[PDB]
Amino acid sequence: KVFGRCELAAAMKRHGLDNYRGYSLGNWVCAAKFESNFNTQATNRNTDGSTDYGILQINSRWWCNDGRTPGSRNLCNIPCSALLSSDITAAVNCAKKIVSNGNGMNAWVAWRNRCKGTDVQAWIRGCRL
């Protein structure tokens, strides 16, 4: 499913991401934009053979199982395909574990390079939250 900016902001909010670990809602929305252009079916394979899945482009090397990443950990205890669903629940739950891991949102390369330090609040502007 390809979410709308404000639609996404509201679902993320309802799922408790707003200010989760100190990261404002706009941060999450910005990351989603640049990681997947708001598409829950987005996939991208890496040179190391792992694959990124979903709206937050969660990695198969640590976070989910896709049956083809040898020596993968499955930290979120879910099949990667669960991260492509229209219901963003597993992705959010999984993102919460990731951001809690020590490097915060720096785990998402597009966030660090394109959101970090910018006016992320612009991402929720005009939305009915």
We report the CATH number of the domain holding residue 55 as 1.10.530.10
Strand runs labelled E in 42-120: 43-45, 51-53, 58-59
The residues annotated as belonging to the active site are 35, 52
Containing domain of residue 5, as a range? Answer: 1-129
Order of strands across the sheet with 43-45?
43-45, 51-53, 58-59
Encoded tokens for 1: 């499913």
Of 3, 2, 23, 8, nearest in space to 127 by CA: 8
Phi-psi region of 82 (alpha: psi -120 to 50; beta: other; left: phi over 0): alpha
Question: CB–CB of 111/105 below 8 Å?
Answer: yes
Domain count, the chain: 1
